[PDB]
Amino acid sequence: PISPIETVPVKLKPGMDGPKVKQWPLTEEKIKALVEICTEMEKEGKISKIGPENPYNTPVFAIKKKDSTKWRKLVDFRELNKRTQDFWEVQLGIPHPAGLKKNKSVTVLDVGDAYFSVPLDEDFRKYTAFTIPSINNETPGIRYQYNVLPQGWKGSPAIFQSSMTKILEPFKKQNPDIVIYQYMDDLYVGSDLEIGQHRTKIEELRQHLLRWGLTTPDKKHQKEPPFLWMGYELHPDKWTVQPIVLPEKDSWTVNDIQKLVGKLNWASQIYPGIKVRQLSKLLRGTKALTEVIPLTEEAELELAENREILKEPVHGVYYDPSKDLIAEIQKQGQGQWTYQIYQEPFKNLKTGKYARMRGAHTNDVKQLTEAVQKITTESIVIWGKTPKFKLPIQKETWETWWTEYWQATWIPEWEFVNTPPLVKLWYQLEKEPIVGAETFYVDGAANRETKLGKAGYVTNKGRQKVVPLTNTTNQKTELQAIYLALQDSGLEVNIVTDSQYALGIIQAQPDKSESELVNQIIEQLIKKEKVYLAWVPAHKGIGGNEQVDKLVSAGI
Amino acid sequence: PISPIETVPVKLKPGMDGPKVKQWPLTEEKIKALVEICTEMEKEGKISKIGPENPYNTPVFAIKKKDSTKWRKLVDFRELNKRTQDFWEVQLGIPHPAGLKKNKSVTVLDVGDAYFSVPLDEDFRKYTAFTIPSINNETPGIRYQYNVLPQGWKGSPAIFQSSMTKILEPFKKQNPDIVIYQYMDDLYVGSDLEIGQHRTKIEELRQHLLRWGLTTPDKKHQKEPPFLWMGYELHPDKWTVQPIVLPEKDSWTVNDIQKLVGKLNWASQIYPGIKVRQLSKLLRGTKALTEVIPLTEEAELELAENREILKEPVHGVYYDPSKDLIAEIQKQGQGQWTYQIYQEPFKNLKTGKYARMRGAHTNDVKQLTEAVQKITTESIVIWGKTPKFKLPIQKETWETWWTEYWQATWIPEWEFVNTPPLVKLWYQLE
Numbered sequence: 014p015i016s017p018i019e020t021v022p023v024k025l026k027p028g029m030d031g032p033k034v035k036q037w038p039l040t041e042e043k044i045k046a047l048v049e050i051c052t053e054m055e056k057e058g059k060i061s062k063i064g065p066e067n068p069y070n071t072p073v074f075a076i077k078k079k080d081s082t083k084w085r086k087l088v089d090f091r092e093l094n095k096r097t098q099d100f101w102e103v104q105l106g107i108p109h110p111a112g113l114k115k116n117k118s119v120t121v122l123d124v125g126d127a128y129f130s131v132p133l134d135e136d137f138r139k140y141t142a143f144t145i146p147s148i149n150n151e152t153p154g155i156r157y158q159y160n161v162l163p164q165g166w167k168g169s170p171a172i173f174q175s176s177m178t179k180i181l182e183p184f185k186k187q188n189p190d191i192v193i194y195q196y197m198d199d200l201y202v203g204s205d206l207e208i209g210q211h212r213t214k215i216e217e218l219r220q221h222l223l224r225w226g227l228t229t230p231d232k233k234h235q236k237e238p239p240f241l242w243m244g245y246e247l248h249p250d251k252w253t254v255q256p257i258v259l260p261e262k263d264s265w266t267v268n269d270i271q272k273l274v275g276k277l278n279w280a281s282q283i284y285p286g287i288k289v290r291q292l293s294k295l296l297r298g299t300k301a302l303t304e305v306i307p308l309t310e311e312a313e314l315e316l317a318e319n320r321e322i323l324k325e326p327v328h329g330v331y332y333d334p335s336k337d338l339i340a341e342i343q344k345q346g347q348g349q350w351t352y353q354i355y356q357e358p359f360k361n362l363k364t365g366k367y368a369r370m371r372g373a374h375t376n377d378v379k380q381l382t383e384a385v386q387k388i389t390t391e392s393i394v395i396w397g398k399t400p401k402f403k404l405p406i407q408k409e410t411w412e413t414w415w416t417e418y419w420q421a422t423w424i425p426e427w428e429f430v431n432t433p434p435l436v437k438l439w440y441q442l443e444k445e446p447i448v449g450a451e452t453f454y455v456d457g458a459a460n461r462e463t464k465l466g467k468a469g470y471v472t473n474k475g476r477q478k479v480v481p482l483t484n485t486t487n488q489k490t491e492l493q494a495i496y497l498a499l500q501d502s503g504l505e506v507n508i509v510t511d512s513q514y515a516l517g518i519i520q521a522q523p524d525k526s527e528s529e530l531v532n533q534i535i536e537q538l539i540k541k542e543k544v545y546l547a548w549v550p551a552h553k554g555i556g557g558n559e560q561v562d563k564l565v566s567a568g569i
Numbered sequence: 570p571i572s573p574i575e576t577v578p579v580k581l582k583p584g585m586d587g588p589k590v591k592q593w594p595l596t597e598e599k600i601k602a603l604v605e606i607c608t609e610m611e612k613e614g615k616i617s618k619i620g621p622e623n624p625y626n627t628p629v630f631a632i633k634k635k636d637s638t639k640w641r642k643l644v645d646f647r648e649l650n651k652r653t654q655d656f657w658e659v660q661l662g663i664p665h666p667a668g669l670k671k672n673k674s675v676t677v678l679d680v681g682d683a684y685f686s687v688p689l690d691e692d693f694r695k696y697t698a699f700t701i702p703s704i705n706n707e708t709p710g711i712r713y714q715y716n717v718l719p720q721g722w723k724g725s726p727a728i729f730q731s732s733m734t735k736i737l738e739p740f741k742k743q744n745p746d747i748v749i750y751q752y753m754d755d756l757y758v759g760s761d762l763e764i765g766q767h768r769t770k771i772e773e774l775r776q777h778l779l780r781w782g783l784t785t786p787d788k789k790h791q792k793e794p795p796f797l798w799m800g801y802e803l804h805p806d807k808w809t810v811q812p813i814v815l816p817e818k819d820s821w822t823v824n825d826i827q828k829l830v831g832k833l834n835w836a837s838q839i840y841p842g843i844k845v846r847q848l849s850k851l852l853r854g855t856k857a858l859t860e861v862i863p864l865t866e867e868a869e870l871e872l873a874e875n876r877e878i879l880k881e882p883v884h885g886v887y888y889d890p891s892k893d894l895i896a897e898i899q900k901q902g903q904g905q906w907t908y909q910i911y912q913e914p915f916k917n918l919k920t921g922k923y924a925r926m927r928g929a930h931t932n933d934v935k936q937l938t939e940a941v942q943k944i945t946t947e948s949i950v951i952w953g954k955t956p957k958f959k960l961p962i963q964k965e966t967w968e969t970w971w972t973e974y975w976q977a978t979w980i981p982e983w984e985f986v987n988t989p990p991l992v993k994l995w996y997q998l999e
């Protein structure tokens with residue numbers, strides 16, 4: 014059953030012609046298995062035999078699935094799709110269940126031969142030419158040509174979709190408010206009507222579509238209530254991913270690990286808490302899916318910490334615009350945060366996680382804010398709205414942050430919340446130099462080639478000190494030098510440096526960085542009373558640097 | 570009504586196909602407003618829904634330009650332009666009046682609604698494709714395409730260039746000593762007469778416009794503290810400065826001297842020949858900090874000498890039309906920000922400061938946005954070109970809120986600075 018719908022105009026890429034592939038014949042029972050279909054497809058009008066004119070060929074395959082009772086054929090337009098223009102991103106984006114409205118009754122219709130009913134541009138047909146020679150290859154004159162949308166062809170999805178949207182147009186007019194979503198070969202119709210009253214409109218729709226050439230194989234409903242779409246399991250008032258099982262080996266590889274992370278992240282949507290900090294930190298090695306990565310102690314305590322949640326099923330609610338939106342964020346540590354969005358208390362709408370990776374040493378606040386972002390963006394993408402934010406942070410601490418920081422930002426409606434992992438700023442460097450504090454002119458370097466450096470300092474009150482180092486960078490030195498300046502200093506101190514690099518990291522006021530040293534320095538910065546810090550040129554710089562660096566250089 | 574007027578065939582730079590930009594997700598309110606607008610335009614024949622065959626796209630936004638009441642439909646043609654207009658930058662480019670800047674007073678007014686009646690080349694509309702995004706990717710995007718001349722586009726006024734000049738003559742005649750530039754949907758008008766006399770000459774042009782066509786210059790209305798009436802009045806008379814400013818008092822302690830010399834060494838990268846060694850020598854003693862040390866002799870010669878080199882500086886003040894203008898702003902005080910425009914590092918064409926009354930709306934973002942816009946127009950006038958902004962903010966953050974305080978018909982190209990510049994002083998530049 015063809016469709017009387019206006020076919021969209023299709024052409025090839027600028028100065029490009031259609032495929033011509035005289036495929037090698039096969040005098041098998043397969044050759045007859047085709048005619049069984051073609052000479053019943055042309056009958057149904059789907060295809061048509063064309064004259065021995067110019068129409069160029071395309072590969073054909075009469076293969077059938079494993080034990081498939083119905084010996085169905087399939088043609089692959091690998092080269093054609095190369096020549097045909099580009100269309101509109103059929104399914105560019107994806108609808109997230111978390112942003113749907115609870116419907117009382119729903120039913121899914123199978124639009125299999127949907128593509129086989131939608132017509133094709135009368136001027137593009139010729140490109141779909143294909144042929145099939147029999148036994149002694151004495152009769153190659155069995156050439157056909159598509160009239161509807163060919164399965165697996167480039168435009169088939171976009172067009173069909175397009176056509177379909179236009180076919181539902183008038184239906185959702187005579188009876189609007191009826192939710193209808195199409196996806197590939199699926200039609201999710203949902204309405205807030207009683208089973209009977211609901212099933213009424215369905216048959217209407219069916220006949221409606223039937224009058225457009227497109228047929229619905231299943232009589233009424235056939236798809237069982239628990240739906241599986243893109244992994245998502247759908248229910249009238251709840252959603253989740255029923256199947257979410259991750260096996261346990263003893264010596265897996267990158268190939269398996271990526272998938273593990275994949276599944277874990279996938280579950281992040283609902284399963285609150287699911288972390289992957291250490292679980293992924295190891296994939297940093299040169300990608301080789303067949304290379305076995307030894308599990309670490311933390312990787313162990315994590316997977317197990319994860320499985321704990323995954324072992325027990327948890328669901329998600331739907332959207333109700335009438336109620337306001339809200340989301341709460343909580344810190345998990347090591348740069349890992351988790352968020353949950355909901356309308357009704359504990360009536361989880363959806364959850365997720367954000368992580369500042371590949372980079373290092375960053376303020377706790379910067380993240381909280383970065384977190385707010387990911388969400389905001391996500392909120393809008395899904396509900397097209399910004400949620401009220403419930404986050405663990407004092408207004409004051411936050412205020413001083415944006416007032417002190419350089420990069421500009423904006424955190425909308427937000428309110429305070431209490432939780433052990435209370436995010437805050439533990440220290441602040443003195444703006445103006447401290448008057449009654451010792452001064453620690455510091456310096457540090459390393460013979461880049463030899464890898465051996467020297468860190469140390471000198472004070473206003475001639476209190477020098479120097480400590481050799483090996484197997485470290487010029488940077489690790491500059492930092493070490495300060496840790497020192499801190500160690501041997503009092504409660505309130507002023508420190509001078511020659512490294513613009515060292516300067517930054519500190520001002521960032523980060524914390525809990527994987528870098529052992531940085532931690533040893535942070536803890537010092539917290540204990541201290543007052544702490545001023547200044548910066549001056551490394552080489553041609555004086556102020557003392559013209560004698561502090563001449564003291565830390567010995568070897569090359 | 571379908572106008573039988575002939576169009577101009579538009580061929581861009583071959584080897585470069587049409588734009589396929591990503592439509593940023595929008596607020597519900599924003600989408601609906603855009604739906605309203607479009608549905609209306611669709612009726613007005615202006616635009617027409619298309620099918621899948623059209624694979625191209627262009628960003629669309631909802632602004633509140635007028636005075637924050639009705640929604641304005643902004644379109645990010647930043648790409649299409651590059652694709653066509655940069656080859657129509659010569660093929661139909663509008664020359665810039667290098668005196669416009671030397672002017673005493675300038676006013677900018679919208680004239681975008683002008684191209685709405687004019688038709689567009691048949692074999693090109695496809696590229697004008699833009700999309701209204703569906704929430705949560707519900708349904709695919711609502712796709713339309715301009716049948717007439719796009720507002721956001723640069724190739725639009727180019728074509729209208731003719732019809733514009735013609736209509737301008739009468740005014741340009743009776744009024745010779747008045748300069749006029751046409752950058753996109755806006756017309757910049759400059760005069761040397763005092764505001765009162767100048768403002769009246771405007772309504773004149775405004776009226777004259779409305780006389781010679783449905784070209785309606787959006788009306789007048791007050792807004793800020795000191796009550797205004799109409800038009801964005803700029804005054805390029807004061808469009809100059811030297812925001813350097815050294816400490817006229819605080820130069821006693823070690824630190825004051827320390828931090829000082831650092832900036833001066835960065836100044837080396839800009840103003841050549843800046844002696845500080847004689848000065849830096851007074852600190853080489855690793856002495857204690859905060860120690861109030863008075864200034865010496867041979868060191869004092871490096872202070873005043875290079876303090877006058879900052880007042881009158883000139884060297885390579887050349888602007889290359891071949892090169893592009895780059896402007897990077899940096900957050901400073903609680904209200905003030907600082908921008909620096911140049912085409913080549915340190916070769917500062919124009920440095921300026923910005924600040925919005927810290928109180929009426931101490932919004933971090935709002936300011937930046939505003940600043941960006943101001944900095945922009947400043948260039949337009951001075952060079953007739955939009956700078957690529959190096960923005961100190963989070964990529965996502967911006968793509969979320971700029972459209973909230975955006976009061977311009979144009980959208981400059983931007984980048985995001987994710988690096989902390991030690992270039993932040995009491996009064997910083999670049």
Ligand SMILES: CC(=O)c1ccc(C)cc1N[C@H](C(N)=O)c1c(Cl)cccc1Cl
Nearest residue numbers: 108113114192194201202203242247707
């Ligand atoms: C966008 C949309 O309405 C949609 C997208 C993907 C899928 C699988 C079902 C969809 N809608 C259907 C429907 N017929 O409304 C649906 C909703 Cl609204 C809520 C819960 C389950 C179901 Cl099946």
